[PDB]
């Protein structure tokens, strides 16, 4: 995360972290239930064999709330291509179930119609992650979060150099130097409604990070709710 704020104790319990063989985080994910992780499909190109760590907030300290989970089944969206970056979604079935605790809890999956008219019509959303704090910096050792305003579909399609499909939405700032960044991919974009947070997006891509007249491109979760339901019946 570029800008934004560090996640305080228990503020982002649904954040998951994909770690490679060197136990290094390379991408993020969202906890959907004790057995399922939602992440981005392009992240399944970022590592040979990987696991999922939950409850981590500071990748440096042995806090005690962390728990590593091995992936039993990887479900990547079949229509995904790095050529377009469309259908950038995937669900991961865990071998062992996550035990919810402080800093470990799922985000709510909303209903398509309700989420589109009530959540994505709201002013902002929240993106979190251990990604780069600067476009040229290194991955963060602290989990960060950033409230990013929803960008109307036309202002964003015009600001983009790439085809913004219906499976994606824009969020961020034109000028302001706050935005998601590399390493945050597959991470949570949630929309809060009356103290309850719902997963509304998946960190996908962007032209740099925090650039003027550029926004964050997220995978639209409402566009894959049934796909997600099917995937969790594994």
């Amino acid at each position: 995360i570029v800008g934004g704020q560090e996640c305080k104790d228990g503020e982002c319990p649904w954040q998951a972290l994909l770690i490679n063989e060197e136990n290094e985080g390379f991408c993020g994910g969202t906890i959907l239930s004790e057995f399922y992780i939602l992440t981005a499909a392009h992240c399944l190109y970022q590592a040979k064999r990987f696991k999922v760590r939950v409850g981590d907030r500071n990748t440096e300290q042995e806090e005690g709330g962390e728990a590593v989970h091995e992936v039993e089944v990887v479900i990547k969206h079949n229509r995904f291509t790095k050529e377009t970056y469309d259908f950038d979604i995937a669900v991961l079935r865990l071998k062992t179930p996550i035990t919810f605790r402080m800093n470990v809890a799922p985000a709510c999956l909303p209903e398509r119609d309700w989420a589109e008219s009530t959540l994505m019509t709201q002013k902002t959303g929240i993106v979190s992650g251990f990604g780069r704090t600067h476009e040229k910096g290194r991955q963060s050792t602290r989990l960060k979060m950033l409230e990013v305003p929803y960008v109307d579909r036309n202002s964003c399609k015009l600001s983009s150099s790439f085809i913004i499909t219906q499976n994606m939405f824009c969020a961020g700032y034109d000028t302001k130097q706050e935005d998601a960044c590399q390493g945050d991919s597959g991470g949570p974009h949630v929309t809060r409604f009356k103290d309850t947070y719902f997963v509304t997006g998946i960190v996908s891509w962007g032209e740099g990070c925090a650039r003027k007249g550029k926004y964050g491109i997220y995978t639209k979760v409402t566009a894959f709710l049934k796909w997600i339901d099917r995937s969790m019946k594994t």
Binding site: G10, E11, P13, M102, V104, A107, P110, T118, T196, F198
Partner: protein, 52 residues
């Protein structure tokens, strides 16, 4: 306005059935008797920040 008006007074999902407001919840929540509130049936319901 039903749902168009303050989410129909629902805590979570809201839909207009028979031209009336019908509320529902996410999994792990049970609708209240007032039929508007959602009650978590567990210690760590979804979408709730853990503040202990």
């Amino acid at each position: 306005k039903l749902c168009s008006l303050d989410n129909g007074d629902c805590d979570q999902f809201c839909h207009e059935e028979q031209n009336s407001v019908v509320c529902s919840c996410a999994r792990g929540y049970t609708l209240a008797d007032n039929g508007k509130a959602c009650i978590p049936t567990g210690p760590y319901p979804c979408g709730k920040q853990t503040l202990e």
